[PDB]
Amino acid sequence: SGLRKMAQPSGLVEPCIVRVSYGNNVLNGLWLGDEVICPRHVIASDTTRVINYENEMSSVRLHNFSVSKNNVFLGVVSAKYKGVNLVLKVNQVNPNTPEHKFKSIKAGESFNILACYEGCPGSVYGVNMRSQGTIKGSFIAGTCGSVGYVSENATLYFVYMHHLELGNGSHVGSNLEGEMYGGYEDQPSMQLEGTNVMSSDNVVAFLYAALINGERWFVTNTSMSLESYNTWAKTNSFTELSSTDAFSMLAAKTGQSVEKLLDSIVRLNKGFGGRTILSYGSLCDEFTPTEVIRQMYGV
Amino acid sequence: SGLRKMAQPSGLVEPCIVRVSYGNNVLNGLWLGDEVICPRHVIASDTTRVINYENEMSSVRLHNFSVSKNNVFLGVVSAKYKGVNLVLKVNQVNPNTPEHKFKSIKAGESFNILACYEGCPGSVYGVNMRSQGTIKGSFIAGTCGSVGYVSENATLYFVYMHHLELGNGSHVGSNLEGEMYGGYEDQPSMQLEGTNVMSSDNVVAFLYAALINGERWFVTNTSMSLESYNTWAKTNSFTELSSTDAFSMLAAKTGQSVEKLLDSIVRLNKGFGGRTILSYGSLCDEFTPTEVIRQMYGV
């Protein structure tokens, strides 16, 4: 038993992290083949004030970049913007480039962060994309360019590169094609997040994890129909649940139907009455149904 | 900003994990040089009944083992107990054996789990040793032999091998010398964990982390002396705090003294009253002061 937010192992991603610096700015990049992708604000003269990226590009000099893997430095032979990222061509192919694809993450999906500090992989942890295209991670100065990835089908996907933190602490990155999640700008300007919408699929998965782990105080002899729940969800910042089909095995193993847990969500969103669920004090939408199933029962 | 429980990257450990089965039992082994270390209950004919490990070793047949990794099958040439572990000499040396040491974890210390599912590294997450020698992880059938590790000053230490789960869900493992943390037996018997004693240092670090992250509802201008707290702590299953010196920097950056947080601990111990702190609904002792500092400020 137990429930912990997991990361998938990091071994294929670690050899791809490089240190990229320009001027007094230092962050991380992703070295694949003979290319390094990193956030374009590494070339900005002053990241604390509004940046004219056309002027920064006009004044850039390739010899002002420093790119390195474990204190061995690479020659930079080309630099281009691609959206909000720089794409650098370097003079050596990464001999540890894994087979990989690029994909974009959608709201409610889980992935892994390899958090890196100035070119060194430091730590690995799981996150879940919020409705507004943000994640709640843990990023400080020096960790831009930290990389999000997910492995599915034994296919490794790179899905995230870290750029900024909003005023409310939410974290904003791009995909590896240089499109910023959520449409945020890579600018030190006040940008508002917008109302967070909880993933109903993930909150049901969480309550099933709680049941499996022996927590059941929130279940009562009450059950809420799917359409009734979806009507409530529309005015309570929860997503609509398309069907209960993803939960069939969990319902069978716990003896609790999804509609029993839809009624729990409605009651618990009002408040827990001072109780906790697996040491959470409010509903958690960071675990997907497949995530829970894999963690509780194996692949 | 942000605080998540993190793991150190897993790339050096992943290539050492092998699948070990014997009869109906399947778990994980740690393959280093020409040795595979795994929990000895893999050769128990019935793990659900009291095991006579002397009889099991006397009846063992090496041809009954299956040890494998990807397309590699490893033949067992000899098998020996070392405390509660089996040490299997195998017919091939691990070509990806990393430089490494072994050490033991003490209560209050953090380390990393590579959760392995019948030979396959599946996830990586961080844990903290509890007072009674247990951890709160996520382990299911097929995950015994999952490996705990820590890296300090670029030195990789192997520190934990997973064996069993107590009736209250606490997880029990051994060091790599085969001594079971907490002294528990590798038997299906009534073993009670005993009262959990929270690490006061860690809870203080947790509250500092919150403050740094802009959460401050739980601090007043009331304080509690180190001596009065330690007296409360002896009666209320918290460790006694030796000094406030571990937190001099945290107090400086936050403007809140350890004594202000000691009073928070006593008030919060009954519960968060419907509020949360860094998305925990009750006090958390899983982060050390050093852990919090490096995550929130860098090395």
Ligand SMILES: *C(=O)[C@H](C[C@@H]1CCNC1=O)NC(=O)[C@H](CC(C)C)NC(=O)[C@@H](NC(=O)C(F)(F)F)C(C)(C)C
């Ligand atoms: C990587 O270079 C950092 C990562 C930041 C640092 C603190 N936590 C993070 O996630 N990125 C920045 O410093 C970034 C550079 C811009 C050119 C995009 N700026 C910010 O994240 C700032 N945020 C804002 O100005 C805000 F979004 F409007 F709030 C802060 C103030 C440095 C966080």
Ligand SMILES: *C(=O)[C@H](C[C@@H]1CCNC1=O)NC(=O)[C@H](CC(C)C)NC(=O)[C@@H](NC(=O)C(F)(F)F)C(C)(C)C
């Ligand atoms: C690895 O082979 C499993 C891991 C367990 C399975 C559920 N969660 C875990 O951490 N270990 C065992 O099956 C172990 C074998 C004994 C011979 C050591 N048995 C147990 O962990 C049992 N626990 C106990 O009997 C208890 F500690 F007394 F409570 C259970 C009931 C299978 C968990």
